[PDB]
Amino acid sequence: DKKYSIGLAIGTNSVGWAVITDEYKVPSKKFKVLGNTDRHSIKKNLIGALLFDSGETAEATRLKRTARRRYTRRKNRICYLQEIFSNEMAKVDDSFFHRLEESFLVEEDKKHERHPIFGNIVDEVAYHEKYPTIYHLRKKLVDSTDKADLRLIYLALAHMIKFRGHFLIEGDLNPDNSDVDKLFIQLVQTYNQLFEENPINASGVDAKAILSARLSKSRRLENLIAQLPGEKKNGLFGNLIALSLGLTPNFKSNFDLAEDAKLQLSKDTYDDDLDNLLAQIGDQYADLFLAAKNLSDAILLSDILRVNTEITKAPLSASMIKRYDEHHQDLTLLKALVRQQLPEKYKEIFFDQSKNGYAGYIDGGASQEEFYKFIKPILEKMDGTEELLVKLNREDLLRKQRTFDNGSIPHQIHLGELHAILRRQEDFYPFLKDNREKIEKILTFRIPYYVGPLARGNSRFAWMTRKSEETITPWNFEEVVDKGASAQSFIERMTNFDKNLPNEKVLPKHSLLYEYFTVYNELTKVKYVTEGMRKPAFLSGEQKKAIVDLLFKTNRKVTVKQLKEDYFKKIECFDSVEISGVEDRFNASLGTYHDLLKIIKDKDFLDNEENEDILEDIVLTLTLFEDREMIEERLKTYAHLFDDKVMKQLKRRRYTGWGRLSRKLINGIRDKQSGKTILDFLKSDGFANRNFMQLIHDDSLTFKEDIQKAQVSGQGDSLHEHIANLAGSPAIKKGILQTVKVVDELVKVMGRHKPENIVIEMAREKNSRERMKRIEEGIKELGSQILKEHPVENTQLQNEKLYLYYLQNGRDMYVDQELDINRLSDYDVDAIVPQSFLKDDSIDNKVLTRSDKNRGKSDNVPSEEVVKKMKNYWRQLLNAKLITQRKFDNLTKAERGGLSELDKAGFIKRQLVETRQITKHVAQILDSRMNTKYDENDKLIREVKVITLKSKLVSDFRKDFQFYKVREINNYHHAHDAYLNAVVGTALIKKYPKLESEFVYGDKATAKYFFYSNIMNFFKTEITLIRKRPLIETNGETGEIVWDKGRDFATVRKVLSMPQVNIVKKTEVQTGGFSKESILPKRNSDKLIARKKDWDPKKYGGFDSPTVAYSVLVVAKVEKGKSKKLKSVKELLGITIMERSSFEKNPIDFLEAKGYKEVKKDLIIKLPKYSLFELENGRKRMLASAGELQKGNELALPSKYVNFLYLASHYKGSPEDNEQKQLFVEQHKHYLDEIIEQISEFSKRVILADANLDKVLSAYNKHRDKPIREQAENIIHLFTLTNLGAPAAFKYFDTTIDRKRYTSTKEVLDATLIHQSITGLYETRIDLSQLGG
RNA sequence: AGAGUCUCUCAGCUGGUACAGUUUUAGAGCUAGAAAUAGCAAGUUAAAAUAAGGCUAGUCCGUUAUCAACUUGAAAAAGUG
DNA sequence: CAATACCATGTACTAGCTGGGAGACTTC
DNA sequence: CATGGTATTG
Ligand SMILES: [K+]
Ligand SMILES: [K+]
Ligand SMILES: [K+]
Ligand SMILES: [K+]
Ligand SMILES: [K+]
Ligand SMILES: [K+]
Ligand SMILES: [K+]
Ligand SMILES: [K+]
Ligand SMILES: [K+]
Ligand SMILES: [K+]
Ligand SMILES: [K+]
Ligand SMILES: [K+]
Ligand SMILES: [K+]
Ligand SMILES: [K+]
Ligand SMILES: [K+]
Ligand SMILES: [K+]
Ligand SMILES: [K+]
Ligand SMILES: [Mg+2]
Ligand SMILES: [Mg+2]
C-alpha cells in the first residue's frame, strides 16, 4: 500500500541511495537495535551512501605469479646442471655444491668451510687475484686450451645459465657474422651496382667507428653523411643508413613514389611494408634493402660487443673486462687527480657512503646516474679530467659489469661462450662431451607461451596436455608435451563460438570464405541508376560475380571510381551512373586472396572450388599457430602441391584475428526448399538481394528455424559471476554488485514491497610514461628535432598545454606557424567540436592554438579555410599517431558539410540519454531481478521501471535551483545525488510518459534540438529564451500532478538539510602482500621478519611493516614479570596476512603461542579494517589497524553554509543573477566566522587535535584581510581536518598543517562497537566495557 | 535497441622471457699506537633468497574477485528487525 | 606518552583472446 | 599517491 521509489548513484568508491515517496519526501523509520546496550531502537532517515576502497584489477597479482614461476624455473636450470656435474664433482670436491648452497649463512651457521670455491683462504684469494670478475674466468675458459678445475668450469657455465639473456632474436647468431666495416662496404657494393652513373667514393671512411659510436642515431647518420661529399642524409644511401641505424626513413622521394614507403626495421609489420615498396620499384632493389638489414644487425651487436672479434671467441666477456680495466685505470687517475687538486674532498668522495660519491656508488645506494650527477661538477672544476668528462657524457665512466643496460644481451651470445667452454673442456672430461647438447639445451630451452605452465591437474591457469605421463624436462619436452594440442587449446579456450550456432567455432578473420562472405554481403546491397532506368536496381547474380572476378580479384581495394569505369563503362557501356550503398571505396576486400596469389602464383588454383577445403585449412593453420616450425609441420600434408620456394613463403605468412560467424552458418546449412546456403543467397537472390540480417530473419526460409533449434543455453551464472563477466573496470564492477545488495536490503526494509521506479546514475571515469612514448614514437616517425631543441621529462607532460605543444610538433594547430614553448600561458586550448555540443575534455577533442579566434566561428567545427590550409599538416600528425583518426575527422568535418542540425540535435540528446553498455547491463540486472511475472500474452510485467540518467541532469538541476554540492565538506553529496536522481527521474517520466522509451529499460532536427534543450524547463517558473510557466505542472493526458513549484522545492531543501545521513564505510579484511617488500639489513628489533624459516633477522635482516588482515579482541591473561604471575588483560591483536591461515586453523593455539593464557574463546571478536566504535559525546572512531584509529564522524554543515561556500569560492548565468549571488555573499560575510565556529565546535567534540585546531584558528585570524573568494577557497581545505577517515595533511593559504594521528586503540576496548548492515539501517551495538575479567 | 562489415581507439584476462635492485656470506686490508684513533691502501665480482611457505609433489600452487552481526549448519547456505 | 619525520621494488620485451567507445556502409 | 609501520626525539 505504501508506494516509494529508489535513487542510486553508482561510483567507483561509493554507492549512494535514497528512498522517496509520492511527494518526493524521504521516509524515516524506527529500526530495532541489537546487542547489549540501553538502546533498543533508533530513528533512521532512508537515505545514505556506502563507501568502499577501490576494487583492484588482477594485473599486479599476475605479474607476481609469473615472476614466481621464473624464479622456480631459474632454480631448476641450476639444479639440472648440478645433477649433471654430480658424480664427477664428487671426485674433485665432495662438498663444493654444499658450500654454494650455504654461502648465505653466517660462519656460525655454516657446516662447511667459509670459502665457497676452494674451501681454503689461500686458494680463494688466489682465484680473485687472477679472476677479479666472473668474465675474466669466462674468457679464460673460452680461449685457453689447458685442462681446467671442474669447479671453475661449473661456475662459468652456471653463471651463463642463471643469467642467460633474452630471446628476442630468432635463429642463430655468430659474432663477426655482422662486421660493421664489412657490412657497410657490402652496402656500398650493392648500391654502386644499381647506380653505375651515380657511385659513392667510400675510401677513407671509417664506417666501423662512426656507426658503432655510442651516439644518437641521427648524429651518427650526420657523421657518416658528412664523410660522403655530394651525398645528403635524405638521399637514397642516407635513407638506407638511416634505416640501418633504426630510424624511420621515407623512401617515397628516393624512388618518385605515390605510396609513402615509410620503413622501420623495428616494427613487426616491416617485411610487408618492404614488399609494397618492392612491388613499385621492382626486385632489383631487394639486394639493397637486404644489405641494410644486415648492417642494422651489425650496429646493434656493436652496442653490446665493443671488442675486436679476431682476438677472442668471448667478445662479451672481453667487453666486460674492458669495462673493468678502464674502470681501474680511470679510478687510479681520478684518485690521483683529486688527491693533488682537491685533497679536502677526498674523504667525502671515496669513504662517505651517505654521499653520491664513489663510496656511495660502490657501497651506498647511489646509482650510476646519481654518481655521474654528483661527480660531473667535480670533474669540470679540476684540470686533466677532459677524457673522464668525455666518458661521463657517453655514459661510459667507471662502469660496473652487472648493470641495467645488460638487457640488450641476446642469449645467443651467452650460448656462444657456453658452447666454446664445453668444446674446450670436453676433451678432458668425458661427461661434458656426453652432456654438451644437454647443457646447451638448459640454456636455450624456454617454455613456449602457447604451452603455459607444465601442470598436472592443480593449476586453474594451465591448459597443457601431455603425450605421455612423465616428468617434463628441457630434453624430453618435444616428446612428452603435445605442443600441437597445447598450442591449439591456447587459442580455442579463448575464441568465441558462433552465437547463431553455439556449437560451431568461429572462422578465422582472414579465411577466404569469410572474406567472400563480407564482400558479397556488402555488394548485394549496392544499387545503381542510369538515364533510361526508371528506378535504381540491385546487382544481379551475374553482375556481382562479374564485379568480383574483374575488380575484387584484381585489386586489393575496389573504389567506386573503379566500379563506374572498370565495370559499368567497360562492360555495361554506361557513361554516367549513380551508385548507392557504398561511399568512396568498398569496406570489404579479398585481402587473403591477393596474399596467397602473390605466394603461390596460381590464380586458377585459387579459383578452383575443389581447393576450398585446402585453402581454408591453410589459413586456419596460419591463424591458429605462430611458431614457424609448427606451421611448417601442419602444412607438410600439402607439400606435394607447391614448390619448396612457395612452401617457404607460405610459412612466413601468418594471420591473427577471428571473425564472428562460423563456416557452418556462412556456407554450411541450407534452406530446405531452395537448397542454398547463406553465401549462395548473397551470390544470387533473384531481385530481392537479401543480406545476412534479412536471410536469418526471413520466415519464408529455414535459416531462422535452424538458428533457434541450435540454441543451447546452459547453466546460469550467479549474480557475482554475471557481474564479473561484464565488460568494465573491476572498480566499477565492485560498485555494481554493491548496488544490487543495497537494493535488496532497501526492499526488505519496505516490507518486501517493490518500488515504483529505480533511478540509477553511473559516474563517468604511469600515465605520464605513456605520454612520453606517444611523443617519442611520434617525433621519430615525424623526423622532427624538437626533443633535441627542447628536452622534457615524463612528469612535465601532465601539463595540458605542454603535452599539446609536443603532440603538435611545436606548431599552431589552426595556423601554419610555430609556437613558443616559453609562451604557453598566452596561448589557448580549444575544443574541436564545441563543448556546448560535445562534453569532451580529452586530448582527442582539444587543440593548442595561439588564439582560438583563428578557429573561425565558435558555434561549429573549425572553418573550411582552416581545413584547406592545415589538412596536410594534420595528416602528418595523424600518420605520426600524434592525433587520432577521430581527432582528424572532427578537425576536417567542415569540408564534409560541417556540423549538421541533426548532429547538434544528437549531441544534446546524448548529453541527457545514457547509452553506455555498462549502464544498460546494470539496468538489465535490476530489471530482471524486480520484474519476474508474465501476463496473458506471456510478455514481461514491468512493475518496476528502471530509469537511467546522466549526471548532467541533476548537476544542472543543482545549479539552476541552488542546491549546490561541495564534495570536500563531507560524504553526504553521494546520498544527496541519489535522492535528486530519484526526484528528477520520477518527475521527468511522470511529466512525459512518452520519454519512457528513451529512459526506461525494456522493449525536424530543429524540433528535437529545441525539445531536448528545453526538456528540463517544466521545473522552472520563468524561462528566458522570456516565457513563463504555471506554479503547478501536471501531466497533460492523465491530469496527475508531477511538480508543485511552491511546495516541492521546499521538500528537496528539507531533505538536503537533514543532518542524519547513513554514511557507511564498508569494513574489509585486508589482503595482498604480506608486508613491505624491501629487504632490510640486520638490526636488533622484533619488528623484523625472517625471509626464511631459519634466517634469524638479527643475523640476516628481513622484512618489517606487515599488513594486518584483521584485528582480534582478546580477553585473556598474560604472564607478568619474572614470576610469570597471571594478569587479566583486554587488548587488540593484529592478525597479519601471513599469520591469518595459522590463526584461523586453531585460534586458541595461535593465541597461546603469542603469550595469552585462559583465552575467553567466546569473547573473541573479529574486527576488520574500518570497524566502527562510538565513544563519548557522539565521537566515533574507525579501526585503521590494531594500533591506529581513523576519524569516524561526519560534519553535517548546515545547507546555508554549504551554499555560501559554493557561491563565495566560485566553485555562472546572467549578469544580474551573478550580481545577486555576489550581493548575497557580501551580505552574509559573517558566515565565515560561523563556519569556523561550526568547525571548531565539531573539532573540539570529536576530532581532538588541540595543536592543529589552534593552528587553524591562528591561520584564519591571520588572513582575515584576504579576499572573500580566497578565504572561502581555503576554508574548503579546512574540512580535511574534519573529514571522515584517515587523517591527512592540508594547508590553509601558505600555512601547512600536518596530520594528527590516533596512534592508540586502547580507548575503543571500552567503547561501543557498532556492526552495521550494508545500508547502516540495521545495527548491532556492543558495549565493550562489559568485557574484561 | 540488436546484428555483420570497415577505420581508429581504450580497457579486461591469460601465457612466455630478460635486466637490475636488495639482503647475508666470500673476495687475507696495511701501518703507527696499550687502546682511543690517525695515515694510507682497497672498491667493479660471486653464491644464495626474492613473498613465510603448501600438498596435490606438479619444472604445480601462494598478493584479483567476494566478506556487518546473530541463529541454525561441518560447511554450502538459508533465516532474523 | 606527543610531535615529528621518513619510508614504501623497478624496468624491459613479447604471444594471444575478449569486450567497451567513436565515425561510417548495410540490415532486423 | 596515500596512509599505515617504524624509529627518533623529546
Ligand atoms: K513513488
Ligand atoms: K606481461
Ligand atoms: K663453522
Ligand atoms: K660501441
Ligand atoms: K655530405
Ligand atoms: K650503489
Ligand atoms: K650487483
Ligand atoms: K567506405
Ligand atoms: K597466427
Ligand atoms: K613439391
Ligand atoms: K590565454
Ligand atoms: K580483497
Ligand atoms: K668482505
Ligand atoms: K576474504
Ligand atoms: K558492514
Ligand atoms: K596486447
Ligand atoms: K576492438
Ligand atoms: Mg620459492
Ligand atoms: Mg644480483
Side-chain angles (χ1 to χ4, degrees), chain A residues 455-506:
Chain A
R456 202 172 70 177
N458 295 125
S459 170
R460 71 178 184 89
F461 309 99
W463 66 90
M464 180 271 313
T465 50
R466 322 164 92 102
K467 282 148 78 171
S468 68
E469 299 175 9
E470 46 175 314
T471 296
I472 300 167
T473 69
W475 321 294
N476 66 0
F477 189 86
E478 299 286 330
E479 286 72 21
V480 177
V481 169
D482 192 338
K483 296 211 304 180
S486 298
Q488 191 171 25
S489 295
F490 166 73
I491 294 295
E492 287 179 348
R493 74 200 290 268
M494 302 189 293
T495 52
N496 272 325
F497 288 87
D498 192 335
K499 267 161 186 165
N500 314 99
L501 302 185
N503 275 11
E504 291 297 314
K505 257 300 163 61
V506 176

Side-chain angles (χ1 to χ4, degrees), chain A residues 541-559:
Chain A
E542 289 76 20
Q543 291 174 304
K544 286 177 294 181
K545 165 98 164 60
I547 293 172
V548 169
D549 289 5
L550 292 179
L551 299 185
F552 283 93
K553 295 196 176 190
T554 64
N555 305 314
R556 283 189 168 273
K557 287 305 191 302
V558 179
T559 66

Side-chain angles (χ1 to χ4, degrees), chain A residues 378-443:
Chain A
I378 295 184
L379 296 181
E380 286 171 328
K381 188 180 180 179
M382 301 173 53
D383 293 332
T385 64
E386 187 174 2
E387 295 176 354
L388 304 178
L389 281 162
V390 169
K391 288 170 171 177
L392 194 153
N393 296 118
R394 288 155 31 184
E395 300 154 328
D396 202 4
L397 168 67
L398 295 156
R399 289 267 279 165
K400 305 178 187 177
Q401 287 70 72
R402 303 300 298 273
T403 51
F404 57 96
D405 52 312
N406 290 339
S408 310
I409 304 172
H411 87 278
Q412 288 88 333
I413 296 186
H414 291 300
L415 171 66
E417 291 184 1
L418 178 94
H419 171 82
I421 293 180
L422 290 167
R423 283 303 188 186
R424 293 301 207 183
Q425 300 300 134
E426 74 177 353
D427 294 328
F428 306 103
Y429 301 93
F431 86 101
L432 291 181
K433 180 180 181 180
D434 184 71
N435 286 271
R436 178 186 47 82
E437 278 182 305
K438 251 196 177 190
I439 294 175
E440 295 175 6
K441 191 66 177 180
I442 301 173
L443 193 154

